[PDB]
Curated annotation (Swiss-Prot), chain A:
Plays a role in pre-mRNA splicing as core component of precatalytic, catalytic and postcatalytic spliceosomal complexes, both of the predominant U2-type spliceosome and the minor U12-type spliceosome. Functions as a scaffold that mediates the ordered assembly of spliceosomal proteins and snRNAs. Required for the assembly of the U4/U6-U5 tri-snRNP complex, a building block of the spliceosome. Functions as a scaffold that positions spliceosomal U2, U5 and U6 snRNAs at splice sites on pre-mRNA substrates, so that splicing can occur. Interacts with both the 5' and the 3' splice site. This is Pre-mRNA-processing-splicing factor 8. The MPN (JAB/Mov34) domain mediates interaction with TSSC4 and SNRNP200. Has structural similarity with deubiquitinating enzymes, but lacks the residues that would bind the catalytic metal ion. Contains a region with structural similarity to reverse transcriptase, presenting the classical thumb, fingers and palm architecture, but lacks enzyme activity, since the essential metal-binding residues are not conserved. Widely expressed. It is found in: Nucleus; Nucleus speckle. It comes from the Eukaryota. It is linked to Retinitis pigmentosa 13: A retinal dystrophy belonging to the group of pigmentary retinopathies. Retinitis pigmentosa is characterized by retinal pigment deposits visible on fundus examination and primary loss of rod photoreceptor cells followed by secondary loss of cone photoreceptors. Patients typically have night vision blindness and loss of midperipheral visual field. As their condition progresses, they lose their far peripheral visual field and eventually central vision as well. Part of the U5 snRNP complex. Component of the U4/U6-U5 tri-snRNP complex composed of the U4, U6 and U5 snRNAs and at least PRPF3, PRPF4, PRPF6, PRPF8, PRPF31, SNRNP200, TXNL4A, SNRNP40, DDX23, CD2BP2, PPIH, SNU13, EFTUD2, SART1 and USP39. Component of the U5.U4atac/U6atac snRNP complexes in U12-dependent spliceosomes. Within the minor spliceosome, which acts on U12-type introns, interacts with PPIL2 and RBM48. Core component of U2-type precatalytic, catalytic and postcatalytic spliceosomal complexes. Found in a mRNA splicing-dependent exon junction complex (EJC) with SRRM1. It comes from Homo sapiens.
From Swiss-Prot, chain B:
Required for pre-mRNA splicing as component of the spliceosome, including pre-catalytic, catalytic and post-catalytic spliceosomal complexes. Component of the U5 snRNP and the U4/U6-U5 tri-snRNP complex, a building block of the spliceosome. As a component of the minor spliceosome, involved in the splicing of U12-type introns in pre-mRNAs. It is linked to Mandibulofacial dysostosis with microcephaly: A rare syndrome characterized by progressive microcephaly, midface and malar hypoplasia, micrognathia, microtia, dysplastic ears, preauricular skin tags, significant developmental delay, and speech delay. Many patients have major sequelae, including choanal atresia that results in respiratory difficulties, conductive hearing loss, and cleft palate. The chain holds residues 633 to 827 of 972 of the full protein. It is found in: Nucleus. Transmembrane segments: none annotated. Component of the U5 snRNP and the U4/U6-U5 tri-snRNP complex, a building block of the spliceosome. The U4/U6-U5 tri-snRNP complex is composed of the U4, U6 and U5 snRNAs and at least PRPF3, PRPF4, PRPF6, PRPF8, PRPF31, SNRNP200, TXNL4A, SNRNP40, DDX23, CD2BP2, PPIH, SNU13, EFTUD2, SART1 and USP39. Component of the pre-catalytic, catalytic and post-catalytic spliceosome complexes. Component of the minor spliceosome, which splices U12-type introns. Within this complex, interacts with CRIPT. Interacts with ERBB4 and PRPF8. Interacts with PIH1D1. This is 116 kDa U5 small nuclear ribonucleoprotein component. It comes from the Eukaryota. Belongs to the TRAFAC class translation factor GTPase superfamily. Classic translation factor GTPase family. EF-G/EF-2 subfamily. The lineage of its organism: Eukaryota, Metazoa, Chordata, Craniata, Vertebrata.
Amino acid sequence: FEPLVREFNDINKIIIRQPIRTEYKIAFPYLYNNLPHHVHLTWYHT
Amino acid sequence: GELYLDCVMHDLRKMYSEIDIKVADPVVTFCETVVETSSLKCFAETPNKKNKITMIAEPLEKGLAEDIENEVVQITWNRKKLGEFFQTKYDWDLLAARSIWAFGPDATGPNILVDDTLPSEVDKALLGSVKDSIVQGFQWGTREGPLCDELIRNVKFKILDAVVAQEPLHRGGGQIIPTARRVVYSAFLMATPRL
């Protein structure tokens, strides 16, 4: 698609244990992004 | 878990505070432990040289700590009954069965506090007065955390010499609480800290 919008996160203070795989931002949108505006919730299991 | 914090962050944003929030990557809480008997023990006093505390550290077994976490080895009953439970479950010594002082960072904590200084603990009138300040320093220093202020799991602290001056009456308690704290730090940090 096209963009819809167009000392805390220090790189010495954050364990990169697993590379954050990008679909986490889909699966859990509030917990993995800052500013989740115009976001839709997901049906996740049947 | 993941979905719990996702739900509460959604709730936080959409119900009470509409403010955009920077949120870092999640870390877990860690703990601390000791896996072997202590080295040549450190004894330390206050700025005024009055009262000393000698403590070693060695790990109480896995079963001991997990049963203290399950409340069955609670000291709230008779000391004789507590000692008999130690004897019938872990081959515990009788002289060590009736001398245990406290637990640790809460009512049921993963540490344990033992006294065995049989010739020198006949000084009981001068021991038990500051024993409660040792407990007030013990619980507080075990919920503080030396390394990165986490909790201390599965470590036995054992006092082997109590040298306290005659009739302190204001010095003893208030000065021995940071002494209990600092000797707890020394006995933990000296001879196998682990995460």
